Amino acid sequence: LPVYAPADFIPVKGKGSRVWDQQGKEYIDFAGGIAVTALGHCHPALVEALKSQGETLWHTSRVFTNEPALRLGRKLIDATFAERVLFMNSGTEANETAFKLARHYACVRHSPFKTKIIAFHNAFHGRSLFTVSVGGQPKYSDGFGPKPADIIHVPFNDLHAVKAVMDDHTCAVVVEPIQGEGGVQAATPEFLKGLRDLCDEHQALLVFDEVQCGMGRTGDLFAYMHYGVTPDILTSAKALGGGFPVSAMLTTQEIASAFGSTYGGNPLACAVAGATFDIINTPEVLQGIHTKRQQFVQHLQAIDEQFDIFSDIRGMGLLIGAELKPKYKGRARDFLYAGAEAGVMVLNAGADVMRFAPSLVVEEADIHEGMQRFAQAVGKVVA
Amino acid sequence: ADFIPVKGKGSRVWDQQGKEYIDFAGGIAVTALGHCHPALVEALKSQGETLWHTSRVFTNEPALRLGRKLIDATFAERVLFMNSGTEANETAFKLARHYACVRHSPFKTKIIAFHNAFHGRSLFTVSVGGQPKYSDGFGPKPADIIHVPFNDLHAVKAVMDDHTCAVVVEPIQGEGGVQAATPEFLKGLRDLCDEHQALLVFDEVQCGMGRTGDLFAYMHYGVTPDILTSAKALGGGFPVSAMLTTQEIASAFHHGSTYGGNPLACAVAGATFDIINTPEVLQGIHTKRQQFVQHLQAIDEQFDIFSDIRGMGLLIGAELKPKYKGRARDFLYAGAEAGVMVLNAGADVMRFAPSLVVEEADIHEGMQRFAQAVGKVVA
Numbered sequence A: 001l002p003v004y005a006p007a008d009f010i011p012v013k014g015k016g017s018r019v020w021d022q023q024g025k026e027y028i029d030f031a032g033g034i035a036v037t038a039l040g041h042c043h044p045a046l047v048e049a050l051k052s053q054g055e056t057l058w059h060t061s062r063v064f065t066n067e068p069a070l071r072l073g074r075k076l077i078d079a080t081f082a083e084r085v086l087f088m089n090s091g092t093e094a095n096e097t098a099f100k101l102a103r104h105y106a107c108v109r110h111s112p113f114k115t116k117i118i119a120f121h122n123a124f125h126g127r128s129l130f131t132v133s134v135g136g137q138p139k140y141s142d143g144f145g146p147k148p149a150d151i152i153h154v155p156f157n158d159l160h161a162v163k164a165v166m167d168d169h170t171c172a173v174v175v176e177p178i179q180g181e182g183g184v185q186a187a188t189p190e191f192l193k194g195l196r197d198l199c200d201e202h203q204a205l206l207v208f209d210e211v212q213c214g215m216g217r218t219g220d221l222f223a224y225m226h227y228g229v230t231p232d233i234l235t236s237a238k239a240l241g242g243g244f245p246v247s248a249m250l251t252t253q254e255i256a257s258a259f260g261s262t263y264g265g266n267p268l269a270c271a272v273a274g275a276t277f278d279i280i281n282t283p284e285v286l287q288g289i290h291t292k293r294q295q296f297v298q299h300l301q302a303i304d305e306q307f308d309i310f311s312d313i314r315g316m317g318l319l320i321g322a323e324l325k326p327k328y329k330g331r332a333r334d335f336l337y338a339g340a341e342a343g344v345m346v347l348n349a350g351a352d353v354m355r356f357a358p359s360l361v362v363e364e365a366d367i368h369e370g371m372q373r374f375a376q377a378v379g380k381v382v383a
Numbered sequence B: 001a002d003f004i005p006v007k008g009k010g011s012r013v014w015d016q017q018g019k020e021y022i023d024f025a026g027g028i029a030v031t032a033l034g035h036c037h038p039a040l041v042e043a044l045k046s047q048g049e050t051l052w053h054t055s056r057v058f059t060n061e062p063a064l065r066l067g068r069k070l071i072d073a074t075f076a077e078r079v080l081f082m083n084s085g086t087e088a089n090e091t092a093f094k095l096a097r098h099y100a101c102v103r104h105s106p107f108k109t110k111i112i113a114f115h116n117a118f119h120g121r122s123l124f125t126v127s128v129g130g131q132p133k134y135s136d137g138f139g140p141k142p143a144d145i146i147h148v149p150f151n152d153l154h155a156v157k158a159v160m161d162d163h164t165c166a167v168v169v170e171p172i173q174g175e176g177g178v179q180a181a182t183p184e185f186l187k188g189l190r191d192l193c194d195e196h197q198a199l200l201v202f203d204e205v206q207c208g209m210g211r212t213g214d215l216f217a218y219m220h221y222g223v224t225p226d227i228l229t230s231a232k233a234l235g236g237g238f239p240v241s242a243m244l245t246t247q248e249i250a251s252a253f254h255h256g257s258t259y260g261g262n263p264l265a266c267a268v269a270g271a272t273f274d275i276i277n278t279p280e281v282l283q284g285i286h287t288k289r290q291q292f293v294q295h296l297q298a299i300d301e302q303f304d305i306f307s308d309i310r311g312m313g314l315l316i317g318a319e320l321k322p323k324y325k326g327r328a329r330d331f332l333y334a335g336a337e338a339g340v341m342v343l344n345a346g347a348d349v350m351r352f353a354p355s356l357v358v359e360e361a362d363i364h365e366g367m368q369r370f371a372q373a374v375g376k377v378v379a
């Protein structure tokens, strides 16, 4: 069930899209620590940002603001629909804050009985009791005692189902624009637009979990920009910090008033995230992501031409899913481990789907080399 | 707060205007080794050049090293690392619930906690937290959490049964007026947990990592918990946390000696641990407390403001007399004006949580500034 690295695979060093273990074995990284290291390992600009801020100031309590946090808040506010930004340490915490805010906004602006949260099967929002209960895998929320109530799950991309359970007692709809863990499934524009319209009709808040698909991952800064559907609340993490734990909850003044346009934020985390933002939010990187996706997809199609293993290639930008044909159902972990043995680090998205989330600046030579290693791994699994 | 800190070094902090402050607050007991400690900066820089991040699929050398250090120095046999104390608390509470579920009964779900407790602001942790005002208004809270007064062993006895999975307690309630547990209370909780087969959970996010003069508060009391949480001081300002428990308990999870841990975080926390867990630092804490307390007594001798000085080691509470009840914020703001950063613990209590290696010169200067602030509020 879970993927655990063996005792002879402990990462010790990373540089760009390359990782070395304790035995000095080199790997090409198409996993990014699960879409976290969006600028690769020990990127010079991020290392510089960490070092200079690390000489100056690391920490301030929630009582104070700081220059890195204010700078990052301003950048996010300028680049998005947001008017207010709250910083935490992780996407889980950001989601906690978003869900709590949606609940509290409904409580004070409308009714204390307006508590229903609508989420989707296969969703992943974190492992805290609240976020795992909003998440759509019962296996992970069972066995921890009474779960926070008034959370309803319906299938992803099923607008009819949402209409059926949505009413004036609904406070929030929570959705990943692309379900990364749940098979790399993208929302249809109809579905997402419908959620926006239903939330408007019922005065509920539309919450986008973009912890995985955000911060350039899709080729747009956020996935909502691709769809042209504006959420009420957005959460971001993982890539935001490039490997440093940091997260952000984005919303409007009107919504945030329910609780300088910024709250919290570790000085060191925000300095690093600012450097990450400055690189990712450029025409060069964002437009390069589409080129790179095409390069990965070409290799995946070539492997499929040789070995015939995939039924679907999907996702957006450098979040790539490759669904295994029915003859290879449940074999995703085996392809992953074979990949590792061949010196390439990949992901799963359930037992039937291969997932790739490499650095957004991954070099062409690394794309080529890693995919040749993955091709070799595939051969060992099927032939 | 009407100023923005831009730079810190040891126990001194500068704002945007270049005004210099003495830091007796430590970002709320987080910067246990002061700002930009050279050993912590060096660890950050060195690991920052090597590897920052691994997913939970992998371990890493800093995580393993930090795990070994915590395992060797405490009751723990297993360590799970997260980013924050709130997250570590989520993990501890979930583990206590799940252990009870799979080892005893799915109906064994009651968590006992205490009034004025703080355990974080996630829905679950704030519900276990003992401040109803902060858990109200977020929709249905997770159920089966009972609160009773801190230090009220009779009350614990009354609500505890075989359906109880956990007792969660801060050995010293930091936020709740800097109230220390009595030895009888903590031993009582241990005995009751043994009797009803519940897990004793120590939230040592604030009172842990050297704060009391021992590495963890449970060592002062000689009462061993089943699960302990640690953050704040653990990373000296870098966000990192740990949940410590035994192999028997940890086995309830669906993996070696450690789980998770950011390589950069764990490298910094390792350097922090190596410094704090020394006779020099730990013994130095008692001497520094005495100096702080003597200053507080001198201030009281002059101004007659305090009714009580409490806490342990370098977590210090000073309770205001009824004449000054509800005015802790006023002394806080006056302190800031006078150039000293302090804390509150409710509107009735002044709190201090300075660097564990705070220089004597800084103790005297900061306390003199606080005396000036006290003098201002009085006049």
Ligand code: NA
Binding pocket: A076, A077, A078, A079, A080, A081, A082, A083
């Ligand atoms: Na904006």
Ligand code: NA
Binding pocket: B070, B071, B072, B073, B074, B075, B076, B077
């Ligand atoms: Na031990």
